[PDB]
Design an enzyme around this catalytic site. Structure first.
Site, PDB file in Angstrom:
ATOM      1  N   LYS A   1       5.749   0.982   1.836  1.00  0.00           N
ATOM      2  CA  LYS A   1       5.062   2.281   1.666  1.00  0.00           C
ATOM      3  C   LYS A   1       6.029   3.338   1.157  1.00  0.00           C
ATOM      4  O   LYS A   1       5.650   4.252   0.416  1.00  0.00           O
ATOM      5  CB  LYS A   1       4.356   2.733   2.939  1.00  0.00           C
ATOM      6  CG  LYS A   1       3.186   1.857   3.296  1.00  0.00           C
ATOM      7  CD  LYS A   1       2.142   1.937   2.205  1.00  0.00           C
ATOM      8  CE  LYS A   1       0.781   1.504   2.774  1.00  0.00           C
ATOM      9  NZ  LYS A   1      -0.264   1.466   1.709  1.00  0.00           N
TER      10      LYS A   1
ATOM     11  N   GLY B   1     -10.041  -2.191  -3.612  1.00  0.00           N
ATOM     12  CA  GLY B   1      -9.970  -2.478  -2.173  1.00  0.00           C
ATOM     13  C   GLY B   1     -11.215  -1.951  -1.459  1.00  0.00           C
ATOM     14  O   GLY B   1     -11.270  -1.913  -0.220  1.00  0.00           O
TER      15      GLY B   1
ATOM     16  N   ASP C   1      -6.992  -9.675  -9.067  1.00  0.00           N
ATOM     17  CA  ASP C   1      -5.893 -10.080  -8.201  1.00  0.00           C
ATOM     18  C   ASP C   1      -4.657  -9.437  -8.822  1.00  0.00           C
ATOM     19  O   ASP C   1      -4.211  -9.798  -9.937  1.00  0.00           O
ATOM     20  CB  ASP C   1      -5.741 -11.606  -8.147  1.00  0.00           C
ATOM     21  CG  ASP C   1      -4.869 -12.051  -6.995  1.00  0.00           C
ATOM     22  OD1 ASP C   1      -4.025 -11.233  -6.585  1.00  0.00           O
ATOM     23  OD2 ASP C   1      -5.043 -13.177  -6.488  1.00  0.00           O
TER      24      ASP C   1
ATOM     25  N   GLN D   1     -11.076  -8.727  -4.946  1.00  0.00           N
ATOM     26  CA  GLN D   1      -9.996  -9.656  -5.004  1.00  0.00           C
ATOM     27  C   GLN D   1     -10.434 -11.055  -5.292  1.00  0.00           C
ATOM     28  O   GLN D   1     -10.007 -11.648  -6.266  1.00  0.00           O
ATOM     29  CB  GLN D   1      -9.202  -9.629  -3.733  1.00  0.00           C
ATOM     30  CG  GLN D   1      -7.828 -10.145  -3.958  1.00  0.00           C
ATOM     31  CD  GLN D   1      -7.286 -10.746  -2.729  1.00  0.00           C
ATOM     32  OE1 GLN D   1      -7.494 -10.231  -1.627  1.00  0.00           O
ATOM     33  NE2 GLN D   1      -6.607 -11.878  -2.870  1.00  0.00           N
TER      34      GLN D   1
ATOM     35  N   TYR E   1       5.142  -2.024  12.447  1.00  0.00           N
ATOM     36  CA  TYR E   1       4.694  -1.721  11.088  1.00  0.00           C
ATOM     37  C   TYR E   1       5.647  -2.462  10.175  1.00  0.00           C
ATOM     38  O   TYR E   1       5.279  -2.938   9.091  1.00  0.00           O
ATOM     39  CB  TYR E   1       4.732  -0.235  10.772  1.00  0.00           C
ATOM     40  CG  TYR E   1       3.913   0.095   9.537  1.00  0.00           C
ATOM     41  CD1 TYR E   1       2.572  -0.256   9.471  1.00  0.00           C
ATOM     42  CD2 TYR E   1       4.477   0.735   8.446  1.00  0.00           C
ATOM     43  CE1 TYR E   1       1.806   0.040   8.354  1.00  0.00           C
ATOM     44  CE2 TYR E   1       3.712   1.031   7.301  1.00  0.00           C
ATOM     45  CZ  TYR E   1       2.377   0.670   7.266  1.00  0.00           C
ATOM     46  OH  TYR E   1       1.585   0.956   6.156  1.00  0.00           O
TER      47      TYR E   1
ATOM     48  N   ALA F   1       0.963  -7.716   3.521  1.00  0.00           N
ATOM     49  CA  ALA F   1       2.203  -8.306   3.997  1.00  0.00           C
ATOM     50  C   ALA F   1       1.726  -9.494   4.820  1.00  0.00           C
ATOM     51  O   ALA F   1       0.722  -9.390   5.507  1.00  0.00           O
ATOM     52  CB  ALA F   1       2.941  -7.339   4.905  1.00  0.00           C
TER      53      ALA F   1
HETATM   54  N1  LIG Z   1      -5.903   1.145   8.310  1.00  0.00           N
HETATM   55  C1  LIG Z   1      -5.512   2.453   8.427  1.00  0.00           C
HETATM   56  O1  LIG Z   1      -5.692   3.205   9.488  1.00  0.00           O
HETATM   57  C2  LIG Z   1      -4.853   3.197   7.162  1.00  0.00           C
HETATM   58  C3  LIG Z   1      -4.337   4.484   7.345  1.00  0.00           C
HETATM   59  C4  LIG Z   1      -3.712   5.021   6.177  1.00  0.00           C
HETATM   60  C5  LIG Z   1      -3.518   4.252   4.992  1.00  0.00           C
HETATM   61  N2  LIG Z   1      -4.089   3.024   4.879  1.00  0.00           N
HETATM   62  C6  LIG Z   1      -4.041   2.454   3.402  1.00  0.00           C
HETATM   63  O2  LIG Z   1      -5.292   2.194   2.728  1.00  0.00           O
HETATM   64  C7  LIG Z   1      -5.199   0.888   1.836  1.00  0.00           C
HETATM   65  C8  LIG Z   1      -6.138  -0.129   2.390  1.00  0.00           C
HETATM   66  O3  LIG Z   1      -7.130   0.436   3.316  1.00  0.00           O
HETATM   67  P1  LIG Z   1      -7.368  -0.135   4.824  1.00  0.00           P
HETATM   68  O4  LIG Z   1      -6.118  -0.184   5.573  1.00  0.00           O
HETATM   69  O5  LIG Z   1      -8.535   0.592   5.335  1.00  0.00           O
HETATM   70  O6  LIG Z   1      -7.867  -1.692   4.523  1.00  0.00           O
HETATM   71  P2  LIG Z   1      -7.154  -3.062   4.294  1.00  0.00           P
HETATM   72  O7  LIG Z   1      -5.839  -3.159   5.153  1.00  0.00           O
HETATM   73  O8  LIG Z   1      -8.287  -4.111   4.401  1.00  0.00           O
HETATM   74  O9  LIG Z   1      -6.766  -2.923   2.770  1.00  0.00           O
HETATM   75  C9  LIG Z   1      -6.477  -4.138   1.991  1.00  0.00           C
HETATM   76  C10 LIG Z   1      -7.370  -4.216   0.847  1.00  0.00           C
HETATM   77  O10 LIG Z   1      -6.552  -4.690  -0.282  1.00  0.00           O
HETATM   78  C11 LIG Z   1      -7.199  -5.687  -0.938  1.00  0.00           C
HETATM   79  N3  LIG Z   1      -6.159  -6.547  -1.432  1.00  0.00           N
HETATM   80  C12 LIG Z   1      -5.189  -7.286  -0.752  1.00  0.00           C
HETATM   81  N4  LIG Z   1      -4.476  -8.108  -1.514  1.00  0.00           N
HETATM   82  C13 LIG Z   1      -4.959  -7.941  -2.805  1.00  0.00           C
HETATM   83  C14 LIG Z   1      -4.592  -8.582  -4.109  1.00  0.00           C
HETATM   84  N5  LIG Z   1      -3.687  -9.504  -4.277  1.00  0.00           N
HETATM   85  N6  LIG Z   1      -5.332  -8.127  -5.194  1.00  0.00           N
HETATM   86  C15 LIG Z   1      -6.292  -7.223  -5.141  1.00  0.00           C
HETATM   87  N7  LIG Z   1      -6.694  -6.611  -3.964  1.00  0.00           N
HETATM   88  C16 LIG Z   1      -6.003  -7.001  -2.791  1.00  0.00           C
HETATM   89  C17 LIG Z   1      -8.217  -6.409  -0.020  1.00  0.00           C
HETATM   90  O11 LIG Z   1      -9.212  -7.023  -0.713  1.00  0.00           O
HETATM   91  C18 LIG Z   1      -8.612  -5.215   0.840  1.00  0.00           C
HETATM   92  O12 LIG Z   1      -9.775  -4.506   0.241  1.00  0.00           O
HETATM   93  C19 LIG Z   1      -3.650   0.582   1.954  1.00  0.00           C
HETATM   94  O13 LIG Z   1      -3.128   1.069   0.763  1.00  0.00           O
HETATM   95  C20 LIG Z   1      -3.195   1.174   3.340  1.00  0.00           C
HETATM   96  O14 LIG Z   1      -1.868   1.349   3.500  1.00  0.00           O
HETATM   97  C21 LIG Z   1      -4.817   2.397   5.968  1.00  0.00           C
END
Ligand SMILES: NC(=O)c1ccc[n+]([C@@H]2O[C@H](COP(=O)([O-])OP(=O)(O)OC[C@H]3O[C@@H](n4cnc5c(N)ncnc54)[C@H](O)[C@@H]3O)[C@@H](O)[C@H]2O)c1
Ligand SMILES: NC(=O)c1ccc[n+]([C@@H]2O[C@H](COP(=O)([O-])OP(=O)(O)OC[C@H]3O[C@@H](n4cnc5c(N)ncnc54)[C@H](O)[C@@H]3O)[C@@H](O)[C@H]2O)c1
Ligand SMILES: NC(=O)c1ccc[n+]([C@@H]2O[C@H](COP(=O)([O-])OP(=O)(O)OC[C@H]3O[C@@H](n4cnc5c(N)ncnc54)[C@H](O)[C@@H]3O)[C@@H](O)[C@H]2O)c1
Ligand SMILES: NC(=O)c1ccc[n+]([C@@H]2O[C@H](COP(=O)([O-])OP(=O)(O)OC[C@H]3O[C@@H](n4cnc5c(N)ncnc54)[C@H](O)[C@@H]3O)[C@@H](O)[C@H]2O)c1
Lengths: 247, 247, 247, 247
Positions: free
Chosen positions: D162, D12, D63, D39, D155, D94
């Site tokens: 989660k 990611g 993927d 991805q 959410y 989601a």
């Molecule tokens: N945004 C926030 O403030 C925050 C805070 C805490 C936790 N998170 C966690 O960090 C992670 C992601 O970080 P984010 O929120 O900064 O970015 P984000 O929401 O863009 O993360 C999604 C990422 O997942 C990848 N992804 C989605 N579907 C996929 C699939 N089928 N196969 C492979 N990869 C796939 C995408 O390519 C992307 O890099 C999650 O686990 C999320 O819950 C985010």
């Protein structure tokens, strides 16, 4: 009793050993008018017998895996109870393969899928379908297990399903509260009839809990006496969870 | 009612608005026979009054700061109730100065001592003193607050006393369980009669809980209906604590 | 290392087996400049000796039961370090009679008072006394034990004291956050050098944690690397607490 | 650095704003050797660029929706890294329709299936696939959020996924612990870049955490410095979670 005047749909009665039977009995003892659902045709007769015993005519088939089945069942139900006061969700399932041995090795995408779908989504699916039939002051209740909170050998994927469920409770309580609907869970200890000499040895009350204990708590949780409790997971395991290294 | 044939001692009734009054009232309503304590010379009259309102003639003084006062009280009660089965602990105190402003600047060694002494030790002190008078299937209950689990402005040292108290519940439950005694706590939300509009806008059930709400939960927890529950902190705050960022 | 340019006060070094020795070593390894306290004159020379090995000549006496001793210690310390970057609180005490047998039977008012005072109040008492000497970016750290969260045989009233302490961590974190100070705790698992076989058998990583494990964690928590963590109780027990019925 | 000698796979990274970008950067800085996944086709470009930026020539497509793609990805990785020291799982999804308004009206069976599949199952799915390639001392890490623990508006179903995740972390930790693997999660607070005005005001540290803060914790958690931590969800939200009613 403290449930008189309440109409409660009860789900998951398979035998008199089943936790839901215990819940039904206690609820009935306290004055509730009950409705029952049953998964397949094979169960129908049995369910019908118990229902009568509990003064009920309302026995509907319902497979929570299918949205149609759900909608259907609540359409039929509305013919008798156009408005009712909640339901008890006592349904859980995971393919038996998933439940033995090393979790990482055991788990599969489909096993993961089914466990979550049946064990957790079904709860909100049911709530989704009867939302407009629920009276202010209604209460929904599901059943959970320590396995949602701690890693327990062999419980494996069910653990993850239960954790999803206990979060479903909080999200449902938050969404449905403003309409007078309460949502809780009971995290029950293991029940002797339905390791344990470990549990008994170590549970503060020194016995395992019974369907009766569980049933009594459920009755309270679905009645107006617990009107200030919502989105909660109540442990009914005799304190088993709050003790440690009990030699 | 579900408390018929139980003798429960209730502490900290000081007014009709008091959480303890709501508890005494519901229990009485469920069939329990009650006894009351009062802290100082001043309250005797009112308390004597309330007691009578709830069919009781057992009103004894008790100052939990003193070991002898507790021993003496139990000696007296024993003249009348040689065996009983449980007591409700609704006592807490911190010097007011402790309770306003920056926690770190406000706290003092003495304010800390006192808060913990009256608010937490007092619970095990009473248990310790009546232990031999408790009947199998007795239940002890104390009152708590969210401040035990989260940092709350101005709750300051009381937050630490309640945490200690919650641990006390666990330790007491594990020690006394084998002999048939259960110990739990209720963590109550803010009560109106006793900011409130934020709390209400954010509570899933959308209103603050009432002393009735609290009393009903208390009665259940002291009844045999809750035989499967011990060492637990039950949240009676309408789901306030399980939500976040609500708006 | 990642602590270079930081000045940290370390309390509770009594031997080379002591968790604080472990913490001092690890912090020193990452480049911190250290200072130490010792409780009584009997400990003096041993401490001076260790400190010397860790490039320090700051060895001050301090009895946390006495406000004056604390104030005096920080006065002295202010002569060499008018400003510093936090401290490590590694002190706990309960009269030994308190720690054996049935909790309800063993606990006393004085034992309870002492345990809470030394084990919990001392943490905030030190913060209060040096508040003005802390640099933005400082970190305070204390040590806890699973006993604060579950009822553990024989741990008895120390359990209530650790619980009060973990809440102290949240209230301090909230009060001091705005001026750039972070506060956290490590909940360390049982240390072989400080049953264990059952413990190792059941811990996921299959061994007890060491003072090196703890020190490395403490070091990170006191460094700017953990700038996004405040008010947390981090478990360094190899996952012991998140598993159940592994026996 | 403290990661020198380790080989970590990072998932990611989709941007320079990514939490996954902040982690890689920090890990890189501590001396780790990095591999990357992407991805789909569109990303390849971006990804190949960041990797270069961090001294990596390892960019593989993956993927997680497909067991096939995962097996392959690891097959390919074993060409360059036949053994490696863990991975960081920074994947969540989601459908967008799922994330707006009343959770009960928004959720759907399919939407729930997907969210749990991608956000939670994917984690253990990767572990399962590279289990044989992990060196003793390996560490797996995933990213979580407060929504797993409390009900957060909009959410919605992500909160349930989660929750499943955090339990996955415990079960994976309990299973893999005995062969030298540690598994943990970070529950990160909202990140400004990638209301916030509200959050800041009420976050003890009075600022939102950064990708650097998160990245620093992740690096520590994947290093040998944290060999005593496993099965844990560390909150990196500036203490936001432990405060309440912050006036
Ligand atoms: N945004 C926030 O403030 C925050 C805070 C805490 C936790 N998170 C966690 O960090 C992670 C992601 O970080 P984010 O929120 O900064 O970015 P984000 O929401 O863009 O993360 C999604 C990422 O997942 C990848 N992804 C989605 N579907 C996929 C699939 N089928 N196969 C492979 N990869 C796939 C995408 O390519 C992307 O890099 C999650 O686990 C999320 O819950 C985010
Ligand atoms: N047995 C225990 O010790 C224990 C402890 C705690 C919680 N529980 C919980 O109680 C529930 C199960 O009850 P139980 O344990 O008394 O056993 P049970 O076997 O009697 O309950 C399962 C019930 O679910 C029904 N069910 C399964 N899949 C269904 C589907 N697709 N559609 C409709 N119905 C379906 C079955 O027909 C059955 O009546 C679960 O929520 C479980 O986690 C059990
Ligand atoms: N007010 C709230 O919003 C709230 C919410 C939850 C819990 N509580 C709890 O409710 C109880 C307090 O009762 P309340 O809220 O009905 O009103 P309150 O604040 O008047 O309760 C304090 C009571 O403790 C008694 N008490 C104090 N010191 C004593 C001593 N030395 N000896 C003997 N008795 C003593 C007083 O006489 C009085 O009845 C506590 O258990 C407290 O934790 C308050
Ligand atoms: N030993 C374990 O397995 C374990 C596990 C988790 C947490 N801890 C915690 O670590 C700290 C203590 O370290 P330890 O357990 O390695 O053993 P220890 O016996 O060496 O720790 C106690 C320390 O407290 C100091 N102390 C006691 N009273 C004092 C007073 N009045 N003034 C000044 N100093 C005083 C002693 O001098 C000593 O250095 C405590 O906070 C304890 O709860 C220990």
């Amino acid at each position: 009793g403290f449930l008189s005047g309440k109409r409660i749909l009860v789900t998951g009665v398979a035998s008199k050993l089943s936790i839901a039977y215990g819940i039904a009995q206690a609820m009935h003892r306290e004055g509730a008018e009950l409705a029952f659902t049953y998964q397949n045709d094979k169960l129908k007769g049995r369910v019908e017998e118990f229902a009568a015993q509990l003064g009920s005519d309302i026995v509907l088939q319902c497979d929570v895996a299918e949205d149609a089945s759900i909608d259907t069942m609540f359409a039929e139900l509305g013919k008798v109870w156009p408005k009712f006061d909640g339901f008890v969700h006592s349904i859980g399932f995971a393919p038996g393969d998933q439940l033995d041995g090393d979790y990482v090795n055991a788990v599969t995408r489909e096993g993961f899928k089914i466990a979550h779908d049946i064990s957790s989504y079904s709860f909100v699916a049911m709530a989704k379908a009867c939302r407009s039939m629920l009276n202010p002051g209604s209460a929904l209740l599901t059943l959970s297990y320590l396995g949602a909170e701690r890693a327990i050998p062999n419980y494996n994927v069910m653990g993850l399903a239960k954790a999803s469920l206990e979060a479903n409770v909080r999200y449902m309580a938050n969404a449905m509260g403003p309409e007078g609907v309460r949502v809780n869970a009971i995290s029950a200890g293991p029940i002797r009839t339905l390791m344990l000499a470990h549990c008994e040895a170590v549970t503060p009350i020194r016995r395992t809990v019974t369907i009766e204990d569980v049933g009594n708590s459920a009755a309270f949780l679905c009645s107006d006496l617990s009107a200030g409790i919502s989105g909660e997971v109540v442990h009914v395991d005799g304190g088993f969870s709050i003790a440690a290294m009990n030699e």
